Design a protein around this ligand. Structure first.
Ligand code: NOL
Ligand code: NOL
Lengths: 306, 306
């Protein structure tokens, strides 16, 4: 028992991280087979950053402008192309550590592990959620661009995030691995703000189930509620609407604990209306929303990865 | 910016995990050079567990009683010895993925990453602290014994924990990698309880510095306090005494933020006496104590690992 903010084991991704230097910019790249993926703003200079035209910028580049360092090994760029906001550097060597992988674009509310890197070297791993406003609340300093987010499914690494930038509230924005930003953000250093965020309701409910699975039951009640009546309460507290498909996803957890989804909804409704009143759930005094239903089932039943 | 509960990259440890089966017990082992380390209770049967004499139990074992599985590769045990509460299985193959490593026994209040494993396969990685009562608040199910905790220092993996057991409050106990339990616990299935825990004061102060480094300043004040006067307040709220050596450790953080340690102590003192009053620090409504001063400096300046 117990319940922790748990990241996937990061070994399969660590074997893909490289350093990419161009001009005065150094950031991280992802080395899969003979291609290195990195943010296209690696080709911007300290004054191109305001309104860059990346097609012009890139056509002025030669392959030898790109310094790719894989550990103590300098990799030779033999070609480059831009796909949306990511640069793809064709290199002459296939990464022998390339895992089985996929590129996926995730939905808001889904979670992933971030492998924070600097100069091609991993610094730390942590769990994130794609917030409803398409930012992530990460931990990223200068040089971290090109760090990736990912999920592991048995043996397959699904990459879903590459880091590009930090917004003024301290939260983070980036793209999928095909270079499409999450959210309305653009890589260009003009004024942008995150947009109002909301709480991921289905995830809060999954975490309340995690709590029950782990012996916290003090927040439960006899009441039930209708989805309609729950969603009126959610709105007022800035929670995502709970859909019927959310309710279905929560089915396994509901069945394992014997608490009907709409009953947990009545519990959450009282937690929103009364607060927690000096009590904690799973070591938190806040309602936690960065565990998906799958996250809860995985950690509470012990799924592993080869 | 941002601040997350950050684990070390787990690749170096994942390459050491193996499955160890003996009788009807399966758990995890740590494969370093030609030795596999695992909990000695792997040799207990479902009724030896009450008052086992492990010397008798082990002398009745033959090497071929130990099934060691390294992926799709069955490893041959050529010898075994017991060291305190860990079994060491000599195997005929050196692990080619053996990292640079050390075995360290940590002090309470120190943090580490746990690589949760089942059947030799990593399930997830998360950050822990050795609690003052020598338990860890982990996430561990049946089959997780033999999972290890560790810190990484540049290129060297310092192993500090191996998982052995779960106590009735849901927290966890285990040993260092030389088999000495943390705390008064013994591997034997008789009544044991954790003992009263306390809050790791120096870590709370480091996290308050993390908050300042990241733009949270609402909890600061003009007051100062004496170490003596602070510790009278700490005691009443079940906090570890803050030593002068703690104050010294907090020096770099103090110098980087311009907030004298004893001034942060005045802030913590008011947080204890008034609570947070609907406000959060670094996304928490609780005072967080599982970041050491080194953890804060590492994450707020971007140290990496080769
Ligand atoms: C790559 O390693 C870094 C990672 C950042 C740095 C600190 N934390 C991080 O995660 N990325 C950057 O430094 C990028 C680089 C530009 C990206 C766009 C195209 C040109 C290169 N810049 C930023 O992340 C800045 N954010 C930003 O410009 O956002 C738009 C904006 C501009 C002006 C006002 C409001 C919003 C960061 C570094 O600037 C602030 C921290 C001041 C927001
Ligand atoms: C190894 O994979 C597991 C890991 C446990 C299982 C669930 N969570 C975990 O982290 N370890 C065990 O199952 C060990 C095995 C024994 C260890 C001692 C020597 C013999 C083998 N057992 C326990 O962890 C039990 N705890 C325990 O016995 O503690 C002492 C005790 C006994 C009786 C009353 C109070 C305290 C667990 C499984 O039992 C409880 C969960 C009921 C505490």
């Amino acid at each position: 028992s117990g319940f922790r903010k748990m990241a996937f084991p990061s070994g399969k991704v660590e074997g893909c991280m490289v350093q990419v230097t161009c001009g005065t910019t150094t950031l991280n790249g992802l080395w899969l087979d003979d291609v290195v993926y990195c943010p296209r703003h690696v080709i911007c200079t300290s004054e191109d950053m305001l309104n860059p035209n990346y097609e012009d910028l890139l056509i002025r580049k030669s392959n030898h402008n790109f310094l790719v360092q894989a550990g103590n090994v300098q990799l030779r760029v033999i070609g480059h192309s831009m796909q949306n906001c990511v640069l793809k550097l064709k290199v002459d060597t296939a990464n022998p550590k390339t895992p089985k992988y996929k590129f996926v674009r995730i939905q808001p509310g889904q979670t992933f592990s971030v492998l924070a890197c600097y100069n091609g070297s991993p610094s730390g791993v942590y769990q994130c959620a794609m917030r409803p406003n398409f930012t992530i609340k990460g931990s990223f300093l200068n040089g971290s661009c090109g760090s990736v987010g990912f999920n592991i499914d048995y043996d397959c690494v699904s990459f879903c995030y590459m880091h590009h930038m930090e917004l003024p509230t301290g939260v983070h924005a980036g793209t999928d691995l095909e270079g499409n930003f999450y959210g309305p953000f653009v890589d260009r250093q003009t004024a942008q703000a995150a947009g109002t965020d909301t709480t991921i309701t289905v995830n809060v409910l999954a975490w309340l189930y995690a709590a029950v699975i782990n012996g916290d039951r003090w927040f439960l009640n006899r009441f039930t509620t209708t989805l309609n009546d729950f969603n009126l309460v959610a709105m007022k507290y800035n929670y995502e609407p709970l859909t019927q498909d959310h309710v279905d996803i929560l089915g396994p957890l509901s069945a394992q604990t014997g608490i009907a989804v709409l009953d947990m909804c009545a519990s959450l409704k009282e937690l929103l209306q009364n607060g927690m009143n000096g009590r904690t759930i799973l070591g938190s005094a806040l309602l936690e929303d960065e565990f998906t239903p799958f996250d809860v089932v995985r950690q509470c039943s012990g799924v592993t990865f080869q």
